[PDB]
Amino acid sequence: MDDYKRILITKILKNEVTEALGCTEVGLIGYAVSLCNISDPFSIEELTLNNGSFKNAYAVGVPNTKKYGILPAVVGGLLGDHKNKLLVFNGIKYSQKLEDFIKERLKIRVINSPLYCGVIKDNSGNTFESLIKDNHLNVVIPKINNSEINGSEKEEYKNLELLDFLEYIDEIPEEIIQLVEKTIYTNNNLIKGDFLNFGNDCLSNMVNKTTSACNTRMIGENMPAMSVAKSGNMGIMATLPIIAYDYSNEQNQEKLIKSILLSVLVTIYATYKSSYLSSMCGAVSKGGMGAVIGLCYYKNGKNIKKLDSAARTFTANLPGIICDGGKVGCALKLASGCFAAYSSLFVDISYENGIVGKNFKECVENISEISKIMGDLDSDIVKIMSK
Amino acid sequence: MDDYKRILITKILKNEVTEALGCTEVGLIGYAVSLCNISDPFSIEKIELTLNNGSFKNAYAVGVPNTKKYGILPAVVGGLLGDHKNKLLVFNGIKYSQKLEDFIKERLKIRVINSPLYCGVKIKDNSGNTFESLIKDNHLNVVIPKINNKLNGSEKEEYKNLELLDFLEYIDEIPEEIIQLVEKTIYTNNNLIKGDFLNFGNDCLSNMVNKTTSACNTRMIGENMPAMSVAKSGNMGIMATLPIIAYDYSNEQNQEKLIKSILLSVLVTIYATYKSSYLSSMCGAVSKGGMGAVIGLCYYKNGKNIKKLDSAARTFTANLPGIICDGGKVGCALKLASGCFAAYSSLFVDISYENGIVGKNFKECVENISEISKIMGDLDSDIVKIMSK
Numbered sequence: 029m030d031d032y033k034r035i036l037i038t039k040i041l042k043n044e045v046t047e048a049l050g051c052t053e054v055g056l057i058g059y060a061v062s063l064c065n066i067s068d069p070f071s072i073e074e075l076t077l078n079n080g081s082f083k084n085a086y087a088v089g090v091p092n093t094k095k096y097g098i099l100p101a102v103v104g105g106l107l108g109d110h111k112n113k114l115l116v117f118n119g120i121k122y123s124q125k126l127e128d129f130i131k132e133r134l135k136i137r138v139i140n141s142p143l144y145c146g147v148i149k150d151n152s153g154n155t156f157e158s159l160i161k162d163n164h165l166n167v168v169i170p171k172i173n174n175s176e177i178n179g180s181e182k183e184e185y186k187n188l189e190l191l192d193f194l195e196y197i198d199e200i201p202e203e204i205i206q207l208v209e210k211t212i213y214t215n216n217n218l219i220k221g222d223f224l225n226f227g228n229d230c231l232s233n234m235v236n237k238t239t240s241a242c243n244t245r246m247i248g249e250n251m252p253a254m255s256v257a258k259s260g261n262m263g264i265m266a267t268l269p270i271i272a273y274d275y276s277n278e279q280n281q282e283k284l285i286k287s288i289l290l291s292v293l294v295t296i297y298a299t300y301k302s303s304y305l306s307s308m309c310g311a312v313s314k315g316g317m318g319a320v321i322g323l324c325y326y327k328n329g330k331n332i333k334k335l336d337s338a339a340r341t342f343t344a345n346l347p348g349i350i351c352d353g354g355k356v357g358c359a360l361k362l363a364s365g366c367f368a369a370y371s372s373l374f375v376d377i378s379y380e381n382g383i384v385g386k387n388f389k390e391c392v393e394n395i396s397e398i399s400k401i402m403g404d405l406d407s408d409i410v411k412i413m414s415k
Numbered sequence: 416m417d418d419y420k421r422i423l424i425t426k427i428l429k430n431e432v433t434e435a436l437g438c439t440e441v442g443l444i445g446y447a448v449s450l451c452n453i454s455d456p457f458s459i460e461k462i463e464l465t466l467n468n469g470s471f472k473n474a475y476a477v478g479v480p481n482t483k484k485y486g487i488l489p490a491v492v493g494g495l496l497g498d499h500k501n502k503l504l505v506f507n508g509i510k511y512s513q514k515l516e517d518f519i520k521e522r523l524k525i526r527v528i529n530s531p532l533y534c535g536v537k538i539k540d541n542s543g544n545t546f547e548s549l550i551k552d553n554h555l556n557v558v559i560p561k562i563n564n565k566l567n568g569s570e571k572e573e574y575k576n577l578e579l580l581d582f583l584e585y586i587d588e589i590p591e592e593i594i595q596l597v598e599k600t601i602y603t604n605n606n607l608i609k610g611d612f613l614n615f616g617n618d619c620l621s622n623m624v625n626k627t628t629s630a631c632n633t634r635m636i637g638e639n640m641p642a643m644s645v646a647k648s649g650n651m652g653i654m655a656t657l658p659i660i661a662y663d664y665s666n667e668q669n670q671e672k673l674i675k676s677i678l679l680s681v682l683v684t685i686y687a688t689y690k691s692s693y694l695s696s697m698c699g700a701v702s703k704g705g706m707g708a709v710i711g712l713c714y715y716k717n718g719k720n721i722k723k724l725d726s727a728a729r730t731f732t733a734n735l736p737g738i739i740c741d742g743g744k745v746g747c748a749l750k751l752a753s754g755c756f757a758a759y760s761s762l763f764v765d766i767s768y769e770n771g772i773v774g775k776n777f778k779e780c781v782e783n784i785s786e787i788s789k790i791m792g793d794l795d796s797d798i799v800k801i802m803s804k
């Protein structure tokens with residue numbers, strides 16, 4: 029209908045929906061290490077990360093290494109090129125000898141701060157330092173210019189309503205339809221085998237597929253994930269429950285496309301609302317709100333009261349949860365999210381009950397404010413993991 | 416097993432496992448209001464209820480018995496229509512009058528404070544008379560007027576130094592009094608099941624979530640039915656017992672096995688509560704009762720297996736940590752439902768200790784969970800600040 033709304037939503041969809049090869053933090057570490065440009069990787073005789081980064085990278089698989097941790101990311105950066113940027117681990121040939129070489133020399137130190145990735149000395153004596161700072165991945169020392177969006181457009185998207193999202197998925201551009209199809213493609217390709225299949229009912233398949241794709245993204249497979257806001261697990265949480273619900277129901281193409289589009293709209297909105305960093309698991313919360321709105325739209329159509337009830341039951345169900353770092357166990361958390369979505373399709377919770385919001389907007393507002401309240405917990409998380 | 420261990424375990428089980436009629440916060444509010452002993456409630460000009468963060472949180476959206484209503488204002492009306500001599504049972508035998516609710520709604524000015532349990536009522540009437548009442552610290556102690564009511568640590572600390580092996584050996588030589596306690600617990604909690612709350616199938620976990628949420632919803636809406644509570648947290652007891660009851664209902668139908676598993680669940684729940692010595696806005700009921708329930712479920716499925724119980728604890732710790740305690744509500748049941756999930760998912764998945772906050776065994780898992788609860792702190796003030804809108 030409206031013009032400014034369609035163009036803003038289309039632009040933000042083209043912006044937020046990207047492809048991230050696995051965990052972004054190991055990718056950033058490898059990119060910084062390749063920016064150090066060590067000529068002979070075996071000639072090395074210095075990594076500084078913030079609490080959240082060290083947490084997320086302590087037990088996550090690095091692409092094309094079949095290993096977990098920060099040392100594989102550093103070795104892959106050594107064996108990578110700066111021109112690949114966040115895809116620094118592409119085309120590499122992992123050498124166990126270089127891993128064993130760097131293990132004795134890689135001295136890592138953690139700091140309490142926002143995003144900070146600062147790196148090495150060689151046999152000759154030369155020292156090469158590099159730094160990547162701020163929430164937006166901005167290189168400060170290699171100065172290699174290279175996603176952002178100005179605040180006015182984000183603010184205009186925050187001023188949208190659920191009705192606007194319902195109207196947008198009825199007048200979808202062809203580029204956005206193909207984007208949704210490519211998203212479903214990338215995230216469905218992440219399903220490899222069984223990870224948590226405990227039945228043949230709908231929620232069984234939902235949990236199975238979601239946990240399998242999350243585990244695939246975690247174990248360091250060389251398969252990209254269609255991420256929203258550079259959080260791949262958030263995109264998995266937003267898309268896969270809806271995919272598996274559609275698989276166990278009508279097997280509808282356009283219906284699933286529209287439901288996932290509304291899910292992504294809700295996810296982008298929630299991420300915009302949760303403007304502050306948080307140690308609360310933002311991926312689970314936001315992706316699950318998106319997924320439950322999409323599932324309610326698939327079940328009841330364009331029904332405002334049903335979507336409000338789903339958001340209320342979700343807010344009452346699984347609010348507040350720790351983001352203890354990218355891990356194989358993260359899949360389990362997403363599994364819980366699936367539950368929180370399905371349970372919200374059959375339960376009504378009054379607005380008075382606790383932190384529950386009065387509608388979709390107020391639910392998202394309350395969840396975002398509580399995420400702001402839970403605050404900086406990454407310091408204590410890193411202190412715990414070190415033991 | 417050792418003798419001192421068995422005697423301590425029996426004492427602590429008979430101590431923590433009590434019967435709570437629930438809805439204790441609205442009951443406290445109604446009792447404080449009834450201590451004013453208002454003969455004619457309709458002569459009031461302004462009421463001033465003062466609650467602490469925790470009390471206002473837990474009583475904001477809980478059902479009041481014999482009122483069929485939710486909130487603090489129904490509790491205030493029920494206290495006005497009650498007698499102080501009824502103590503916490505001010506709401507028994509009452510006939511709720513919508514007219515008195517509509518009258519008091521215009522005059523009830525509630526104010527929140529940052530303190531331990533505090534319920535102070537200050538009522539004025541048309542004549543000019545003022546009636547004050549106050550309840551401080553524990554529940555049972557009214558200060559205005561001065562009807563005092565007083566509420567060892569060595570036993571708690573000795574219980575903290577036990578191992579899961581002690582709990583496994585105790586459920587093999589159980590005294591008869593403790594067996595009767597477990598059976599009465601199962602009876603009380605199965606009687607709390609009233610209808611369906613989240614039944615979307617006839618499979619095992621469907622029954623688990625359904626029955627658990629049904630009994631929690633029954634305890635929440637203000638029914639005058641007692642609940643077998645552990646550490647006076649009824650939802651904790653439901654979370655610890657009912658998942659095991661429902662898994663046994665959908666599997667082997669074994670009596671002594673279910674008794675032993677629920678006893679181990681209660682042991683693990685009490686242990687987790689003892690370890691989390693500091694207050695937290697994190698949902699302690701879900702966490703502790705679910706740790707008990709998942710240990711009991713692992714004991715029912717795989718028996719006396721240390722690695723199996725370790726894996727269950729690891730997957731549980733990785734699964735659903737840090738849920739909010741946003742006040743006693745109908746939605747609380749949903750959280751408990753999630754707990755069921757968090758337990759069942761741990762019976763078929765192993766999570767390495769390297770994955771995040773997970774500990775190397777059960778003991779370390781509980782220790783990390785307790786430390787994170789201690790770190791999260793109060794936060795209830797901001798919770799009520801959010802709820803007030």
Ligand code: SF4
Nearest residue numbers: 261311351353354358
């Ligand atoms: S818990 Fe959620 S936010 Fe934290 S690492 Fe896992 S997927 Fe990401």
Ligand code: SF4
Nearest residue numbers: 650698740742743747
């Ligand atoms: S939300 Fe959890 S901690 Fe809070 S009252 Fe309900 S069961 Fe207890």
